[PDB]
Design a protein around this ligand. Structure first.
Ligand SMILES: O[C@@H]1[C@@H](O)[C@H](O[C@@H]2CO[C@@H](O[C@@H]3CO[C@@H](O)[C@H](O)[C@H]3O)[C@H](O)[C@H]2O)OC[C@H]1O
Length: 189
């Protein structure tokens, strides 16, 4: 079990963040493996991957994802200049993160269609401090907890629709949570 923060474990970059509310335990395991157990958490996100990401990485993931409430399983990361928080959402709990959001396209990739959206966070935490910034989403229609993600298909589709990315910062397979409970065990490569 580890502190919120970033670093490397068994060859993989990890990032683990929470809002200080408690109720979340994040564990690094062998190789590309990590687990998350949470109960009446606040806001958090953690996982394993790369620092920096690339714009054509093929990300593989496998495991078990059992949210009880608001939670996502995604390819998650950031760009700088412009500052963008992005998600390729493979599964989720009680809330589709695109609810109420403007649909800006579709993309077929890795066995499913995905719907593309853009949202905005206002004076929220980020990799550069409190800021206002856009979020890009691909939301998979066919939910799963194992597979491969050809990231170039999403980044290219986003760019086509006017959702461009800057320089890549980190890029991980992550479990997100917002005031919820659950467990998950995921292996990345
Ligand atoms: O110390 C800083 C770290 O705390 C800082 O971490 C980033 C903080 O913002 C986090 O993003 C939130 C995760 O939840 C999403 O649901 C929200 O939309 C985000 O606002 C991000 O994951 C962390 O990496 O990085 C900067 C350090 O100096």
């Amino acid at each position: 079990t580890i502190q919120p923060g970033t670093g490397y474990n068994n060859g993989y970059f990890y990032s683990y963040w929470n809002d200080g509310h408690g109720g979340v335990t994040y564990t690094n395991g062998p190789g590309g493996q990590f687990s998350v157990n949470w109960s009446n958490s606040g806001e958090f996100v953690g996982g394993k991957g790369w620092q920096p990401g690339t714009k054509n990485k093929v990300i593989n993931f496998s495991g078990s994802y059992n949210p009880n409430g608001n939670s996502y399983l995604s390819v998650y990361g950031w760009s700088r200049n412009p500052l963008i928080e992005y998600y390729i959402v493979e599964n989720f709990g009680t809330y589709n993160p695109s609810t109420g959001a403007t649909k800006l396209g579709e993309v077929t990739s890795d066995g499913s269609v995905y719907d593309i959206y853009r949202t905005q966070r206002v004076n929220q935490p980020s990799i550069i401090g409190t800021a206002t910034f856009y979020q890009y989403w691909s939301v998979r229609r066919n939910h799963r907890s194992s597979g491969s993600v050809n990231t170039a298909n999403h980044f290219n589709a986003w760019a086509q629709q006017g959702l461009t990315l800057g320089t890549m910062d980190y890029q991980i397979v992550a479990v997100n949570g917002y005031f919820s409970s659950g467990s998950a065990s995921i292996t990345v490569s």
